[PDB]
């Protein structure tokens, strides 16, 4: 039995009333549980039997539903409520989980701070050449990175990395690395890092020559 | 309070057999609970692995059942998990958990009884089955009853199992087609009869290739009670890799505010600890999650400082790798 949670991501601010949906592919009566998982931590039972609050969970958390459609309502959000939420069917074997809904802090939009770094003289004098680009402290999460060698797009040898929402300023960061040989890197001059994000029509371009 | 502690390795060689144990505190494993295992990949959601019942019975997620073994040791108050032929896909944080038949308190004097079947509800022809009727403490008589022929069976062989519950067992040594049907429990306590339990279907499967069947096909329940995970262990991270211990290569990253960094390339295994100016610089640092660069790890860590402090003052990144016992410092010098 497939459990489909929606949306995949929801943005709200403290004090807000929000609602998360969970749909079952078949009728499952009221046999649904809600779990909460904060970043870096183990899960926690919140609601069992669709609507029953587990002992010691705040009355802000309310669960509702029967058959195929199930809802989780959190009224008057607190900082500790920004977490991942999973629904689970417990009537049939296997008792499979939903894919989760991440509840994040809706802060003001912020453009990325783009930095480009050429290979170090220590990495080069060992046969390697990594060009690193940083796309830091931007909001919302959705960003696109692109590499250009002498004005030509490059996808091979590119490795990307994304941080979780910052626990202090609520932004997001990203690191992209284009790795090649000292021989390959020494054949070209222009190295560009291009960032496309909601806060601008034109992408942010950061380049270096040599 | 109830505690569950995971124990085992951090690293497991590819095509090996992973062995984990869960140590239970403030409870007994020999109780009406389903001792379970769940796993979470590095960036994925939760996957239900399997569970072990009081009867010793086991259930495993079909996705990977062949490679799975869940056992229980009552004497040591623990349960275990074994995983054969492990691949990179078996990389995760592994949790041991307790599943319980939670009840919203509606009744207290004569609460509605429960019916269960051991080993299950789909029994092969000629084989045995036992019904377990559960009720409060102090029951004098338990009754099992059949729907289609409305036959009943009474027993005073009642036994207390917990400070709140009591039970009776009804065995059918050899099942036949005429034994299949719907069964319930009702008990007599303090000059009164309880509300009847919910029905539980018992199927007797035929001895041929052609045999086939509100749950899916054969996925019939074995209890009227719904079990819910109410306690989780804090988890144990397991990494599946054929790689060798390798220390990192630390490379400096040189360009009102300025961003500098460090590239920490080709190490095994995670983690690595990155600080800036021995922790003195902390407010503007971003250390990125590691990516898998051909069975070795790579990460970057950025620092943001005012232009007045660099290059006039030295900025150094401190990289520690506990596994290889290496601790490196790299100064960020400017470029032209
Ligand atoms: C589990 O994690 C929590 C973090 O809130 C901690 O209090 C607890 O001591 C940890 N350890 C055990 C054995 O539960």
Residue numbers in the entry:
A (entry chain A): 2 to 211
B (entry chain B): 1 to 213, 222 to 263, 271 to 351
Article, verbatim:
We expressed the two chains that make up the Fab fragment of antibody MGD21 in a secreted form from HEK293 cells. This antibody has a kappa light chain (VK1-8/JK5) and a heavy chain in which LAIR1 has been inserted into CDR H3. The structure was determined by molecular replacement using LAIR1 and the Fab fragment of antibody OX117 as search models. This identified two copies of the MGD21 Fab fragment in the asymmetric unit of the crystal. The two Fab fragments adopt the same structure with a root mean square deviation of 0.26 Å (calculated over 475 Cα atoms) suggesting a highly ordered linkage between the variable domains of the antibody and the LAIR1 insert. The structure shows LAIR1 emerging from the CDR3 loop of the heavy chain and lying across the antigen-binding surface of the variable domains of the Fab fragment. The long axis of the LAIR1 insert is positioned with the β-strands aligned approximately perpendicular to the groove between the heavy and light chain CDRs and the insertion and linkers interact with, and occlude all five of the remaining CDR loops. The N-terminal linker (linker 1) is 10 residues long and adopts a simple loop structure that joins the antibody variable domain to the N-terminus of the LAIR1 insert. The C-terminal linker (linker 2) is longer at 34 residues and is more complex in structure. It extends out from the C-terminus of the LAIR1 insert before zigzagging back towards the insertion site in the heavy chain variable domain. It is stabilized by hydrogen bonds to the LAIR1 insert and to the antibody heavy chain as well as by a disulphide bond to C93 of the antibody light chain. Each of these five CDR loops was partly occluded by the presence of LAIR1 or the linkers (occluding 12.7% of the accessible surface area of CDR L1, 18.3% of CDR L2, 47.3% of CDR L3, 34.7% of CDR H1 and 16.0% of CDR H2).
